Design a protein around this ligand. Sequence first.
Ligand code: NI
Ligand code: NI
Ligand code: NI
Ligand code: NI
Ligand code: NI
Ligand code: NI
Lengths: 459, 448
Amino acid sequence: SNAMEDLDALWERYREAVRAGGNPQALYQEMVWPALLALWREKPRVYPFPQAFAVSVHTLGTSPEATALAILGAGAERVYVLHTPESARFLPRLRQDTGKDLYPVEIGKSDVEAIYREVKRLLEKHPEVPVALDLTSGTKAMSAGLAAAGFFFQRFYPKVRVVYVDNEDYELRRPRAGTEKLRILPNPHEALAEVDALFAKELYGKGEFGQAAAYFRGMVGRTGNQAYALYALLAEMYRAWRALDFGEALKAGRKLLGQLSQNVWLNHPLNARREALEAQVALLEAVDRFLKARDFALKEGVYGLARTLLHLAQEAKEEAAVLAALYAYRALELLLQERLALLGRRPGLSPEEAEALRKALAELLPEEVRLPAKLGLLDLLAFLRLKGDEALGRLSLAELRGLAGALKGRNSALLVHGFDVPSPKAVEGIARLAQGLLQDLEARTALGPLSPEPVPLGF
Amino acid sequence: AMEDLDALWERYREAVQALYQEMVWPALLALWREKPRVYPFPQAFAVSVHTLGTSPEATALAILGAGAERVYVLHTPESARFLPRLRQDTGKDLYPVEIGKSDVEAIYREVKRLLEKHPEVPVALDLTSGTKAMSAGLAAAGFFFQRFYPKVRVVYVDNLRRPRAGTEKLRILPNPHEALAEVDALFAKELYGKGEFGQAAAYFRGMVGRTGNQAYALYALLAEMYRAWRALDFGEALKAGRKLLGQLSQNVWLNHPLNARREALEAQVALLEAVDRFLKARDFALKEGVYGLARTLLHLAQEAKEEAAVLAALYAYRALELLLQERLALLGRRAPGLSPEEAEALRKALAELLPEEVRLPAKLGLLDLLAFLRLKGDEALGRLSLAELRGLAGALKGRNSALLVHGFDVPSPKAVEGIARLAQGLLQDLEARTALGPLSPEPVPLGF
Ligand code: NI
Ligand code: NI
Ligand code: NI
Ligand code: NI
Ligand code: NI
Ligand code: NI
């Protein structure tokens, strides 16, 4: 590699020329710079891994040489030079040492805002190709602004990379001739493994449990730390729980508690809220078992199911009305059914009862109106309240008559058997009624801490 | 105090580098000590972190300017020889931390540790001194961590051959969003790409509020149309689509990027119109609205298949039910159109499928409706293998048995999958018998 060799020889000759005592600036300009330029012309030195760039953008200040090296090292077809007004005079020489067509763009020395604007415009212009942002030359504000722009815009233009010419200083108070290397400045997200936890925590606070679980699981692979696995389990539980997959939720929670039990994890932050987690997993057990059993005697399973549905209805209430009404309807139906289970039957209708019920329903809304084989929602209200039901007897008639409209419409909704779009006031009425019943049932149940919200992550 | 510094600078230029030291330095120092000059708007800092390269003076002025009680100095091997002068000029004790000159990841690690140590106080990250990799690294770390430590700020000392002594200003470096409002736009696009249509709509609305441009109001109407569509509120979706279409008709917007997809857009809005008609009439003669409703429900089922299997089962059940009901409308029947020879024939058909004493409810269920439609030689259903009808029979019986309707079952993914495939075939058949236009399926690309 002769160019490299005759260059090292020129560096030692330079050493002796400055040891003799000449002004080393001109001795560098004549002795060294054309051989270094030659070395980078023939074979650009890039690290850590070689890359192809379609576009390169370069801040420019006092030192044209390093920018020339950076242009040659990125090897882009299209080249932009973000330069201060003073350094425009350097652009012909920059054009000559480099042999590229340059696109100059003038920027004030303190104008960081303009750096941001120029990067944004340039990425809108080149949105699908690898782009190199070279911060080597310029004021601290220009270079830091370019790096900050690159890393920020990587979120929307993932082929952007930030680069710079790393020079190592080695008597001769100057970088050694052949040691400069074009490097990629690593993104802080890339370079810090554990910061994924921050992202995960953020996503956990907003209830996006699946994505938080993904961040935790991948962090296990990257950093090799198994504590995050536990966090993953937790998020997955809350995902399966919110998805009404109670079996998957219970499985994940049991695995999590079994991990929290080992001595190796006694100091895991999740052990600080261990009581609440055991209460929640207990809820999951009760619900899973009640789903298998369909027995309305197990009050705790009915409670967990209904409460989960009501939580989902309240979360859907503003942006997904039809969904919300579906959830709320199933909750209220379950709760009324447990009320009936307090009595004898699930169908046990005597004719004195059937007649008295036609009376009750008729007086509510015409006694000719007929009653179906399985009891409706308002049907169920009338049968239970007709039997003086404590929480259903407390009902106000003003509310009752306005609910009556919503209660007939349960199977008639878009997502069950009909085409109704729900009236939001009807959704709120169903939800409020369901909530009062949920509270009465909660009173006659054996409950843990009763913590609705997911557990705080502890870090 | 500062006028005095100016007098010293004119006297400097007249007496004209060590004379910059002796003449000017302690007066500049003293100006920064007495009242530090911080811009654009001053503030207090609890923690200060400084990279240190070859220029200890600017770092001294930065340490004074930030006014922090705890000062961390991130220095190179060489830079250690500057630590006394720093302590002498600032009059502060310093926590030194050694770094390599291009060890950027050690800068990132240090900032991370220091922010874990000080999570709820204003922290100034000063990049004035250091290699390009050190300063760029500190700025990058500051802006990245700002999302999780909002009180972090990045700062720097802003500057004949020397800069005039009184003009140095400790400045706060803005992050890109602070300096460029329009990037909230980019955020919108990302949300729009992920399906969170409401948040995209709100973003575009705010952009109209600030920039005063109505094109982003068109984008907001687009996102709101898709949000209402996804929520199965076809009235509001039809509303927003109508208005937007009327705008893209107007001449003021002839170059709007959305017009670049108008042929798709129109079709979708027509679809909404059809659906609205159907929903008001409950009349299965309106084939277009049936197709639009069933297709929306099937898209929702597919997007919920992985994570929300219960919800996806509900969606797919409703789609399949609507499609079978339309197949029934072909024969001019509904839901009660039974005669005894037919009911018995269906008992024998169903029993042969699954024991010939089965009960048929008054109103037909999914499996009952399907077998009945075979008993009437309906074409699309008639070309099912008896094997796959046996394999679908279980999932077809659980129509009202699912957790989200009348029962408690969790779906097997094969059951939801098979019901969604059956409904898909019926949907293609109905697609032949409608004219819904170009009908691009996914949301139209924003066009920027
Ligand atoms: Ni040679
Ligand atoms: Ni990550
Ligand atoms: Ni979401
Ligand atoms: Ni919640
Ligand atoms: Ni039903
Ligand atoms: Ni989709």
